[PDB]
Amino acid sequence: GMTEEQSQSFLTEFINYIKQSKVVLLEDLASQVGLRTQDTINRIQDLLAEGTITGVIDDRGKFIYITPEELAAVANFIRQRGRVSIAELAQASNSLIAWGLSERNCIEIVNKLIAQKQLEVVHTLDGKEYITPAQISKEMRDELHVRGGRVNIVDLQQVINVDLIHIENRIGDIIKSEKHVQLVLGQLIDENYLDRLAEEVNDKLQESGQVTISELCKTYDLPGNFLTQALTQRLGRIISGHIDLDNRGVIFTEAF
Numbered sequence: 001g002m003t004e005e006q007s008q009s010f011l012t013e014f015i016n017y018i019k020q021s022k023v024v025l026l027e028d029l030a031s032q033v034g035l036r037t038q039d040t041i042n043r044i045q046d047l048l049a050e051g052t053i054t055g056v057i058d059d060r061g062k063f064i065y066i067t068p069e070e071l072a073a074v075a076n077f078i079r080q081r082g083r084v085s086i087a088e089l090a091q092a093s094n095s096l097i098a099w100g101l102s103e104r105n106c107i108e109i110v111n112k113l114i115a116q117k118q119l120e121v122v123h124t125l126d127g128k129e130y131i132t133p134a135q136i137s138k139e140m141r142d143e144l145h146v147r148g149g150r151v152n153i154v155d156l157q158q159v160i161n162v163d164l165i166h167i168e169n170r171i172g173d174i175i176k177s178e179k180h181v182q183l184v185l186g187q188l189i190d191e192n193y194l195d196r197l198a199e200e201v202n203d204k205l206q207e208s209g210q211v212t213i214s215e216l217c218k219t220y221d222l223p224g225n226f227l228t229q230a231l232t233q234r235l236g237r238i239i240s241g242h243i244d245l246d247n248r249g250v251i252f253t254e255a256f
């Protein structure tokens, strides 16, 4: 049958067509090997599946060769944007690949980069944007500083529009990088919030005269050991108090 001289010549004839233009008209290439257009496509489908050649096939029966330099351009474009819509990526496509790609074709490329471990991204829950885990860290920090310095991780999930695990995975990154930021009972808490909390404790101290840690823990819903170390760290710089030890750690005004 066909396959003896076909399989040997097909790949070299394909390459000869790729040298002339990275865009291959599969109907036209099917004339140069004298084959059925559908049989021609199927062998290219198979060659892409085997991992033999890098490219995509549009809805109108053209194949597009993509160089490793052009893949690298696609991966770096998504890195630099951090968050980007599949629609933006299709518009950008001609500047990155010298060919205007369908949204589908762009997805096929991104999924290739993911599998070859040349890019690290995640799908938004609407399926409409790609976001980098570096950009998730950034958008967690922006929404933390925005929402006052204390925010639940579950609220950041809703906001950033990505599955929970992709927020939960960046918590190593936000505590190594930001020495001012800490994880407490499913929330991220900012140096700026603890200073603001210390101010409103000192205002309630200069009114009550005295106040107990167990009363502040019920007031702000924070754990004892954490809240004690956060307030005792701010004693004298922000709180005009004196610590003493009762049944519980207790704070009262010195200048009284």
Ligand SMILES: [Cl-]
Residues within 6 Å of the ligand: 166, 169
């Ligand atoms: Cl991941």
